[PDB]
Amino acid sequence: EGMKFKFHSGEKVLCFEPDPTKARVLYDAKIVDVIVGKDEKGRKIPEYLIHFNGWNRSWDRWAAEDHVLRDTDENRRLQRKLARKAVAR
Structure with a gap:
């Protein structure tokens, strides 16, 4: 790999709407x-295969590191706001 990954396989997370x-x-x-x-430029990045909870595996998708957040109180609060x-309505 060479590079540093902020998240790891198995890690429960908060992922932004990819659409x-x-x-x-x-x-x-x-x-x-x-x-x-x-x-977009061909520059190496880390990427994560995301499964979204309560959605079947057809909704699985690759996301860039910044589209994923650690599952914390702080990000839970943001989840509520968003x-x-x-x-x-």
């Missing part, structure tokens, strides 16, 4: 795999 057509929110999620990938803001 840009959808409201920004944080899902309860789990790291399922980790590789070295690339950004979720209640997304209610459109």
Whole structure:
């Protein structure tokens, strides 16, 4: 690998809505795999296979490190804020 990974396989996490057509929110999620990938420019980055809790494995997707947050009180609070803001009615 060479590089440093902030998260690890098996780690329960909060992952942002990966669909840009959808409201920004944080899902309860789990790291399922980790590789070295690339950004828009071809520069090496870390990437994570995310399974989203309560969603079947067809929703699994690769995310960049910054789209994933550690599951903490602090990020739980943010999850609440983002979720209640997304209610459109």
